[PDB]
Symmetry: D3
Subunit: 163 residues, 6 copies
């Protein structure tokens, strides 16, 4: 058996989003990024000549990216933000009493504590494994999945799961 | 006399900002970008061997970028947004009655009608000529200034002035 | 009125194709490329804040690229190739008596004399103006259209039309 | 002793080739790519200041690439292609009865089952170790060799050998 | 606990320097490079949402780069160079009796034997750990630090320390 | 007749050199760069399908680059440097009385006043037209030649000649 590592990466695997980091003692101003995602995986080359078809990987990365793209990333588990539902908006009040309000539909509520690159990457990795499907990955012999997310190309975070 | 065209471009000449486009009949959701700026100019090579010192160009592009970076870009002349001052926030009401509110300090109020790439580029070009200084540019023989702004590397707008 | 130049460019605006150059006294071996296309245009910024919406440009460039992608590029006007229809194949006989045969469906018959970068670019430019629609371009004030095609990133050809 | 990992990568380490994937139940149309190869290795830094001279690595990667470049990649061990010698051509008949014919000299016969990125990478890795020479690699303390091949920059396969 | 790997990389993390390689039996001519440095590290994501703040990493990489930038790199432990102090210059005499002389202030004396990419990388790694501070890295849970240095983008050396 | 513009650009069209800028009132420290050159030209597409064969352009750009590569760039017409021949070295004395000495063979004597990007570009343009040959360019209908030189990718100078 022959192991290969596949990498799919593209300026297409992007989500252009607004965010701000907040944690204990720190809040920054609202801004945004063209976030980019790459996926790496390892398995044995199968009888058909592939570890797993690149086209499936690309389809599923684009799908996950598209869910995030063109929204404000709202970290629904933050311990330093007060997230209120007001009519059809989310109102966010910070530790320093700063207030934001956005239409709910402009936001993507993500089960993270901070909109950091690291926590966004963990979320995406989990979503990708779900979307490609873990049993399907195992049929293809895949035993390692790894996502890299960048806020900007100069700063990236990479997370993995052995499966 | 020998003409040369200088180009300065860098992932450093960036402003990571939130925005949304609105015009008659169209509003999009809040999102953001790593905007990037390049500057091109033309003049004669001077006796010192330069058209104009690259380091001055870089300093002034970084300065203009830094003013925008890490904010929401607020187009203060939009004919389809109602921009209200509420306490220490800007409240923005759209044609479709969508409402946003952001701390004033999180916003940069820019004298444009739309936060399009084109209008942002025009603004930056004007600011750059002011910051480098038009009489200084003329002492160096510069007769053409051109800015390229990208929301994402795949889509760029370029504007110029003959001076 | 304010002129802007728009550029759309992406590793997505690709057509991965087989070809070979043939002209009088020269034939090369069958090979291929990841061809890439960029589009540049000029017009006035309209009241909506755009010269013309980038999304329309991207949609139409992708459409033209997709027609070419994943085929052999067959220059149907070559004066040095004998192009025969044999059953459901094209059989190509060269000046040096070299012979090729490919299923017709694997080929894209393009109204060019040589599969050079230059002639491919001319073809794409014409197709793009047709697909975006010339009257529509004129409604947006566009007066210049320019395509760059590369066989490989190190060698590109650029063609334009004033409209 | 101090371990270092060397990487050599260049748009020069390219082979511009035609191919098509075929496996049980699947055939695609003839097309091509600018394939790109990078080489990574690990060893101890030697007394001369290098793990192994980059110039040797580059020379040998270019040599292997040049053997493939500008041809159709013919997978000589495919279980779904019927590969016939007809005069000075190879005639290829597929499971769906599609037929191709190319001059033999336009083809590179490679001891692989599929012209996938993965199997091409395995072939290149083996060829590179042969060309650099395994005993020479061991004199330099090299204990790991790894090749990355891309059909297009967005999709890459990486294979390695511990030596 | 969740491990993440952070990467910071930028054309900004550059040192534009002159050098030449010399070892037993080999001297090359004086030349230079735009050297580039990237830093990778691993640790657990902390309660604040980061492994360690990217801004600290960037600040410290820029600081180390700036110390080297715009000088001749003088390997002070070379066994094949005779390094003499002459007035306010360093005079370097080679095995082949070639002689150089540079103002001392134009040189950076680095505790390496050869100005190879590998040895420069080792030096930078050590300097970076000192500048970020090893106890601080350990407070953040960082257990792995890795530097990549390139003389040119096509040839890179990577070194690491487990901490 | 159909005009096309050809561009050839590659990390291969490089010269890795040492230099320093000096002009009246300014001297900088010795350092270096991976300089890069691109060539753009315009002409009509000829009957063979090319403006001019890319391979000729590439060959001649590589040749010019190779002459400069791996040396100190010595501006032989500087009005602020005293350039002395001492044995088999060049000794350079600056306005501030700084002194350098390099073997003559490590230097390329270039007929420029400053080793600026602009003046290096002018020199390269002239050399390229000579190497490709002006009458040959005219046989191909070429009427415009343009060189871009960068010290680093963030700062480029472009010069042209109408022919
Ligand atoms: N580690 C880290 N992750 C981030 O997402 C991050 N974002 C910032 O804006 C500043 N530092 C950061 N540092
Ligand atoms: N021309 C143009 N300029 C933009 O800034 C723009 N932004 C978008 O989000 C979509 N289309 C655009 N089209
Ligand atoms: N001008 C030019 N156009 C091409 O498409 C081209 N293709 C080649 O393979 C070699 N030279 C070329 N030269
Ligand atoms: N894993 C994988 N390897 C390939 O070479 C490949 N080529 C394709 O055209 C489509 N999917 C692929 N998938
Ligand atoms: N391994 C290696 N390291 C270098 O820094 C290096 N520099 C050169 O100029 C030529 N070969 C090299 N080889
Ligand atoms: N115009 C310009 N040309 C150069 O070559 C240049 N080099 C520098 O080091 C600093 N500024 C520069 N400015
Ligand atoms: Zn951010
Ligand atoms: Zn946008
Ligand atoms: Zn070709
Ligand atoms: Zn393919
Ligand atoms: Zn070097
Ligand atoms: Zn310099």
């Amino acid at each position: 058996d022959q192991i290969a590592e596949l990498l799919v990466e593209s300026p297409l695997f992007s989500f252009n989003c607004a965010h701000f980091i907040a944690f204990k003692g720190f809040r920054e101003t609202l801004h945004g990024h063209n976030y980019n995602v790459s996926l790496r995986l390892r398995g044995n080359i199968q009888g058909d000549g592939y570890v797993i078809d690149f086209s499936i990987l690309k389809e599923k990365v684009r799908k996950v990216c598209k869910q995030l793209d063109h929204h404000f990333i709202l970290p629904m588990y933050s311990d330093v933000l007060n997230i209120q539902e007001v009519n059809d908006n989310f109102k966010i009040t910070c530790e320093d009493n700063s207030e934001y309000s956005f239409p709910k539909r402009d936001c993507v509520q993500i089960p993270i504590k901070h909109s950091s690159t690291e926590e966004i990457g963990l979320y995406i990795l989990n979503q990708l494994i779900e979307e490609i499907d873990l049993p399907f990955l195992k049929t293809r012999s895949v035993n390692y999945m790894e996502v890299t997310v960048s806020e900007s190309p100069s700063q990236k975070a990479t997370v993995h799961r052995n499966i």
